[PDB]
Amino acid sequence: FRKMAFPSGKVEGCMVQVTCGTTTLNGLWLDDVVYCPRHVICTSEDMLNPNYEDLLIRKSNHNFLVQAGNVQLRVIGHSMQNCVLKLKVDTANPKTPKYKFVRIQPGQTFSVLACYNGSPSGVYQCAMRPNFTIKGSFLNGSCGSVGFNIDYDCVSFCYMHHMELPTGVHAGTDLEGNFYGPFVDRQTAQAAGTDTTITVNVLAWLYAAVINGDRWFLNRFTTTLNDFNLVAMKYNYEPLTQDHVDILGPLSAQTGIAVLDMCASLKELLQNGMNGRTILGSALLEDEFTPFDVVRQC
Amino acid sequence: FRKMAFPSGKVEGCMVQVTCGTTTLNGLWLDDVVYCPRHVICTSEDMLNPNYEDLLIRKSNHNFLVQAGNVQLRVIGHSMQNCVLKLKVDTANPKTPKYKFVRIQPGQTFSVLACYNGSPSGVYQCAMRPNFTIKGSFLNGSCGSVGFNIDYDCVSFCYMHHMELPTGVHAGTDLEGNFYGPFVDRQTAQAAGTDTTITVNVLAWLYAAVINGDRWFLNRFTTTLNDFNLVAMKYNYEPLTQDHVDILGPLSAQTGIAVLDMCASLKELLQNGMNGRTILGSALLEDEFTPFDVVRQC
Ligand SMILES: Cn1cnc(Cn2c(=O)nc(Nc3cc4cn(C)nc4cc3Cl)n(Cc3cc(F)c(F)cc3F)c2=O)n1
Ligand SMILES: Cn1cnc(Cn2c(=O)nc(Nc3cc4cn(C)nc4cc3Cl)n(Cc3cc(F)c(F)cc3F)c2=O)n1
């Protein structure tokens, strides 16, 4: 098993460049609106402690250079929604897919189309960490790149990239401009909270192991969810939610292994280690494959 | 530092479904020609031991059903080039990108657009193994999926997927229909030669590790190129050539770590193991990033 991204074509056709003065980043063109980080309105001297309200009042439509490739899109309206700028343009994007805006939970995965100057450059799968960062791969110029899932030709946009943190992890917003985590769009040092292991995804990976016949870790025990959650936190593992139990349903049904029985097998692995035995050819327990990812690849 | 694929939109626009009787798989539609594995002309019985020239002479254009999404493309000519069938259709693909067909060499990487019944499903990065297999992620229905690289809006197609071997690795052809490796397009158990590790790629990845702050494996030991290659060969690593050393030049300059100095680090890793430590989060030495892949991502 390896990480696989969604085909990126439906998002590639929406990527544009947005420039304000010399400040430049990526934007997302859906119907007749371009969405982008409001940080674009900052000059170099504004980036440290921007007053976005004061910065926006000084701007008019004609101060925004929006380009699809070399082709300018004329801006006919602008507004700010939390940390995203919405630029109304005079042309509806003919490549607009069916889409929605969603806000994801930690542990959920998504594909990232990394872009530079409005030009798509690469695609890879990412997971939202419990500390609301993502361990992405981004260079300078990537601000405004988006993350997404595709379900039955509908693109669910979930992430817009804003910044890199001092630890090298990445932070951003949903497409309504609300940050994941306790971050602000200022060029100031912001540390991520202490991270934890995504339990629901480790469990998904154990189910993937069982589906593939690697099942030595299945023990003869069960547990309650509450008991498991209390032990999990002692090992820096996330507690499971009721939604987590439910999204493990399909894998539990496919394998005949009750979710709480798998929890008991994982608890044994936390309290005793793996004894130099491997699971799916890996000595480490993978935590960036969701239950949906497992059924998708198997 | 992530495994990163090229944006797949230019290739998505070219995927179609090809069917002959009950047999169906993916094709690549460029201008007025659809390219697909010639295995599509086999019945269940033919697959086990096909005489392809015999099977093809017994086919007419009307025996080929090509579907592009909802629309059927009329076949007006057909021919065979090695293991690839070329179907002339009465319609040019308006989404045809600038493209070339290239045959890649062991160790080089490419993006795979995995498709099922003509519909793109996922994108990920692969390497051509020294034994001319690829460790892909492919399911039933993926026959005809292609691998590619993109340079300045030109798609270089390098791989067309044919089959999964008993070990779970994958085998295929270039777009002229010539297999990579000693395989044949027949449904019979086929083994590959013993694989080796792509040394220049391991070194590139070690540089990626240093660039991203992971330095524990460095040492003050030295080695000559020949003495490194003696140890590498002992451990079933491919030889490192002076061309490889030259290609690693930019990463040596960026990090200030001489190539032969990084060879001395790798030598110790081969001889001592990783002592339970990880590099870029991996417990094993990763060999599917080329030097160009590392430079581009870093
Ligand atoms: C290495 N890396 C990894 N991810 C990132 C993302 N990123 C970015 O692409 N750009 C940023 N600052 C800008 C500088 C500009 C210079 N010009 C001429 N134009 C520019 C546009 C931008 Cl956005 N930043 C920093 C950053 C961006 C924010 F949106 C924010 F709220 C705070 C920040 F500190 C950045 O992280 N780079
Ligand atoms: C698990 N897996 C991973 N990769 C693959 C690729 N693959 C494939 O997709 N299909 C194959 N056989 C077919 C059966 C069909 C049944 N119908 C109704 N239509 C079919 C079409 C195909 Cl192609 N194979 C097997 C295979 C395909 C070849 F092209 C070949 F030369 C030898 C082979 F043994 C397959 O490997 N499956």
Q: What is the CATH number of the domain that holds A274?
A: 1.10.1840.10
Residue type, B245: V
A137 contacts B1? CB cut-off 8 A: yes
- Residue A50's contacts (CB-CB under 8 Å, 6 or more residues apart) are A39, A41, A42, A185, A186
- Cβ of A124 under 8 Å from any chain B Cβ? yes
| Three-state secondary structure of chain A | CCCCECCCHHHHCCEEEEEECCEEEEEEEECCEEEEEHHHHCCCCCCCCCCHHHHHHCCCHHHCEEEECCEEECEEEEEEECCEEEEEECCCCCCCCEEEECCCCCCCEEEEEEEECCEEEEEEEEEECCCCCECCCCCCCCCCCEEEEEECCEEEEEEEEEEECCCCCEEEECCCCCECCCCCCCCCCCCCCCCCECHHHHHHHHHHHHHCCCCCCCCCCCCCHHHHHHHHHHCCECCCCHHHHHHCHHHHHHHCCCHHHHHHHHHHHHHHCCCCCCECCECCCCCCCCHHHHHHHC
Burial of B131 (0-12, 13-18, 19+ CB in 10 A): middle
Element (H, E) at B98: strand B98-101
Concatenated DSSP letters of B107-147: T-EEEEEEEETTEEEEEEEEE--TTS-B-----TT-TT-EE
Cα B228 from Cα B238, distance rounded (Å): 11
For a mutational test of ligand 1's pocket, the pick from A113, A143, A165, A179, i.e. the residue with the most ligand atoms closer than 8 A to its C-beta, is: A143
Q: What is the CATH number of the domain that holds B17?
A: 2.40.10.10
B297 contacts A7? CB cut-off 8 A: no
The answer to whether B142 touches B115, Cβ cutoff 8 Å, is: yes
The answer to whether B29 touches B73, Cβ cutoff 8 Å, is: yes
Cα B99 from Cα B30, distance rounded (Å): 9
Q: What is the DSSP letter of B279?
A: B
The answer to whether B171 touches B129, Cβ cutoff 8 Å, is: no
B294: nearest CA partner in chain A: A137
The residues facing A291 across adjacent strands are none
Nearest to A142 by CA among A108, A116, A113, A107: A116
Cα A7 from Cα A151, distance rounded (Å): 11
Q: B67 — phi, psi (to 5°)?
A: -120, 125
From the list A8, A126, A284, the residue facing B123 with the nearest CB is: A8
Q: A18 — phi, psi (to 5°)?
A: -120, 125
- Cβ of B208 under 8 Å from any chain A Cβ? no
- Residue A166's contacts (CB-CB under 8 Å, 6 or more residues apart) are A189, A190, A191
B7 contacts A9? CB cut-off 8 A: yes
Calculate how far, in angstroms, residue B127's C-alpha sits from the geometric centre of ligand 2: 21
Q: Which two tokens stand for residue B154?
A: 């030109």
Q: Among residues 34-93 of chain B, which lie with CB inside 8 Å of chain A?
A: none
Phi-psi region of A44 (alpha: psi -120 to 50; beta: other; left: phi over 0): alpha
With contacts defined as CB-CB under 8 Å, which chain B residues touch A283?
Answer: 283
The residues facing A154 across adjacent strands are A98, A151
> Min CA distance, B276 vs chain A (Å)?
9
Burial of A261 (0-12, 13-18, 19+ CB in 10 A): middle
Cα A187 from Cα B34, distance rounded (Å): 51
Nearest to B61 by CA among B17, B25, B18, B29: B18
Query: Rounded to whole angstroms, what are the CA distances from B164 to A152, A294, B48, B50, B255?
Result: 27, 20, 14, 17, 40
The residues facing B78 across adjacent strands are B87
- The residue written with tokens 């069938």 in the block is B85
Cα B237 from Cα B219, distance rounded (Å): 20
* Dihedral sign for Cα atoms in the order B22, B25, B30, B33: negative
The answer to whether A123 touches A149, Cβ cutoff 8 Å, is: no
Concatenated DSSP letters of B182-230: S--SSSS--PPPPP-B-HHHHHHHHHHHHHTT--TT--S----HHHHHH
Nearest to B66 by CA among B50, B85, B83, B42: B85
Cα B206 from Cα B221, distance rounded (Å): 16
Query: Rounded to whole angstroms, what are the CA distances from A207 to A233, A271, A283, B211?
Result: 21, 19, 16, 35
Residue type, A267: K
Which ligand has an atom closest to residue A39 CA? 1
Q: B170 — phi, psi (to 5°)?
A: -125, 150
B3 contacts A2? CB cut-off 8 A: yes
Query: Rounded to whole angstroms, what are the CA distances from A212 to A209, A239, A263?
Result: 5, 26, 19
Cα A217 from Cα B261, distance rounded (Å): 42
Nearest to A87 by CA among A40, A139, A121: A40
Experimental approach: X-ray
The residue range of the domain holding B22 is 10-89
Cα B129 from Cα B1, distance rounded (Å): 21
Within 10 Å of residue A21's Cβ, how many Cβ atoms?
Answer: 12
Calculate how far, in angstroms, residue B277's C-alpha sits from the geometric centre of ligand 1: 33
A3: nearest CA partner in chain B: B124
Burial of B54 (0-12, 13-18, 19+ CB in 10 A): exposed
CA A130 to chain centre: 11
Q: B11 — phi, psi (to 5°)?
A: -90, -35
Within 10 Å of residue B30's Cβ, how many Cβ atoms?
Answer: 20
For chain A, the straight-line distance linking the first and the last C-alpha, in angstroms and rounded, comes to: 9
Element (H, E) at B293: helix B291-297
> Min CA distance, A4 vs chain B (Å)?
5
Q: What is the DSSP letter of B277?
A: -
The residues facing A152 across adjacent strands are none
For chain B, the straight-line distance linking the first and the last C-alpha, in angstroms and rounded, comes to: 8
Q: Beta strands B154-164 and B170-173: pairing type? A: antiparallel
The answer to whether A17 touches A26, Cβ cutoff 8 Å, is: yes
Q: Which two tokens stand for residue A41?
A: 């309105």
Cα B52 from Cα B38, distance rounded (Å): 8
Runs of H (alpha helix) within B2-76? 9-12, 44-48, 52-57
Task: List the resolution, Å.
Answer: 1.6
Cα A184 from Cα A271, distance rounded (Å): 38
- The residue written with tokens 């991204």 in the block is A5
Cα A243 from Cα A110, distance rounded (Å): 18
Q: What is the DSSP letter of B79?
A: E
Cα A178 from Cα A172, distance rounded (Å): 8
Q: Is B152 helix (H, G, I), strand (E, B) or coil?
A: coil
The answer to whether B123 touches B15, Cβ cutoff 8 Å, is: no
Residue type, A278: T
